[PDB]
């Protein structure tokens, strides 16, 4: 029927002066563009078909041709930057924005999907979509008393597209676009579908990634408790972006950080820190590191929640990248902690796993660890206990590792490791 045509046949049909022939030919193009094994996107582009498809977007009298073009353009825009750029150069942005208003939900949804792919290309197209005025009609599609009455695939596409309009960093989206979208995003974050929740968390994660002014506008909407609740979800696709967003927030001010603490976040961390998914452990440990970089009373909350043995555990055994984050969490904690906090850290068993790590071929971890040693010595000094500390480092084999590091081909390692022996060994 319209299955398996050549591109030259599709060209013949689209150039006929017959709307029905054009329709058949567009659907044929769509079915070519819908196969998983190498769809001939470049062949279609090379044939000159994009501008014709874009003009079919405007055929209100022909709803089926509007849909097949939408779908064909969707799949093209789904390709490389060059393929997406061809769609945009065809004038497809305003035309897809106009179709958001279609009375046909399947057509309106296809327009949403296409705009998602265009914004997903990066900063410039995201921003180009926003200048065309996509946001208002996108949001007007979600202006319903209850989200549950929308078709679910449709709601998912809206959510994902809005999330691509929040994404990317150099530059971040316009402040006023972010302000416009946030209220609706807060609503979607309370919706009960897992994909809608996952992609709402992704959007919040994009929006909390950067300067503290951007964190602020999110935290101000009061989403942190709902984030923390999602952080406890059983679905890994929801936990991953909820954790990234929580982690982005605690890179912010002490007050912003305190908000995730007040939300109950640290109660979820015994399991996040022992999560069998190695990426959740990494991210959770990085998160812990920025909380240990907080106030003393924030550090104290890490203590009260029983989290320091979990940090010992991760430093002891974890994929190397997680250990690296753990080393940071310790360096931070020892640099901002009370002496009593640091004594506590040592009582939990930090020394021996910290020393084992000095065998790592990774200049940066070594610096981070020597820094933590020095910080801990500085607390031992204040208590007349450096000798008691030197013995533990000695007994676990830490001196051999510090001694070996003097002749290290790195100016920072040599200085601080000779300095440690000078002062303590």
């Amino acid at each position: 029927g319209t299955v398996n045509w050549s591109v030259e046949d599709i060209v013949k049909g689209i150039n006929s002066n017959n709307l029905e022939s054009q329709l058949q030919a567009t659907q044929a193009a769509r079915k070519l563009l819908s196969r998983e094994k190498q769809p001939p996107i470049d062949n279609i582009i090379r044939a000159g078909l994009i501008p014709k498809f874009v003009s079919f977007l405007g055929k209100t009298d022909c709803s089926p041709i509007q849909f097949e073009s939408a779908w064909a353009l969707t799949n093209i825009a789904s390709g490389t930057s060059e393929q997406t750029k061809a769609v945009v150069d065809g004038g497809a942005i305003p035309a897809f924005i106009s179709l958001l208003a279609s009375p046909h939900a399947h057509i309106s949804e296809q327009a949403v999907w296409a705009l998602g792919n265009i914004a997903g290309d990066g900063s410039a197209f995201r921003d180009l979509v926003i200048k065309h005025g996509a946001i208002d009609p996108l949001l007007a599609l979600l202006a319903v008393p209850d989200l549950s009455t929308l078709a679910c695939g449709y709601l998912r596409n809206l959510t994902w597209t809005l999330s691509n309009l929040c994404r990317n960093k150099n530059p971040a989206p316009p402040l006023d676009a972010v302000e416009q979208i946030l209220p609706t995003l807060v609503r979607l974050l309370h919706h009960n579908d897992p994909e809608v929740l996952a992609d709402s968390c992704w959007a919040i994660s994009y929006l909390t990634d950067g300067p503290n002014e951007r964190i602020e506008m999110v935290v101000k909407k009061g989403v942190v408790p709902q984030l923390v609740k999602l952080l406890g979800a059983t679905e890994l696709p929801i936990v991953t972006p909820a954790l990234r967003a929580i982690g982005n927030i605690v890179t912010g001010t002490d007050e912003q950080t305190q908000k995730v603490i007040d939300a109950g976040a640290l109660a979820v961390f015994p399991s996040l820190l022992t999560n069998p998914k190695t990426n959740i452990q990494k991210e959770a440990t990085w998160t812990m590191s920025n909380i240990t970089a907080g106030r003393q009373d924030q550090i104290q909350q890490v203590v009260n929640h029983g989290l320091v043995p979990f940090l010992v555990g991760v430093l002891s055994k974890a994929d190397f990248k997680t250990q690296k984050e753990a080393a940071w969490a310790i360096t931070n904690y020892t640099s901002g902690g009370t002496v009593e906090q640091i004594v506590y850290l040592v009582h939990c068993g930090i020394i021996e796993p910290l020393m084992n790590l000095l065998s790592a071929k990774d200049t940066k971890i070594i610096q981070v660890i020597l820094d933590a040693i020095s910080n801990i010595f500085q607390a031992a000094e204040k208590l007349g206990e450096t000798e008691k500390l030197s013995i533990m480092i000695e007994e676990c084999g830490g001196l051999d590792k510090i001694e070996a590091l003097q002749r290290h081909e790195n100016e920072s390692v040599y200085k601080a490791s000779l300095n440690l022996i000078e002062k303590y060994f």
């Binding site: 819908s34 691509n164 994660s205 950067g210 972006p241 990234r244 890179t251 990085w286 920025n290």
Partner: peptide, 19 residues
């Protein structure tokens, strides 16, 4: 500020073909 802000980029699907 001991805060470290620049995580490994991560997201949902960037682009998506229909079927």
């Amino acid at each position: 500020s001991a805060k470290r802000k620049e995580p490994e980029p991560k997201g949902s699907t960037k682009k998506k073909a229909k079927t």
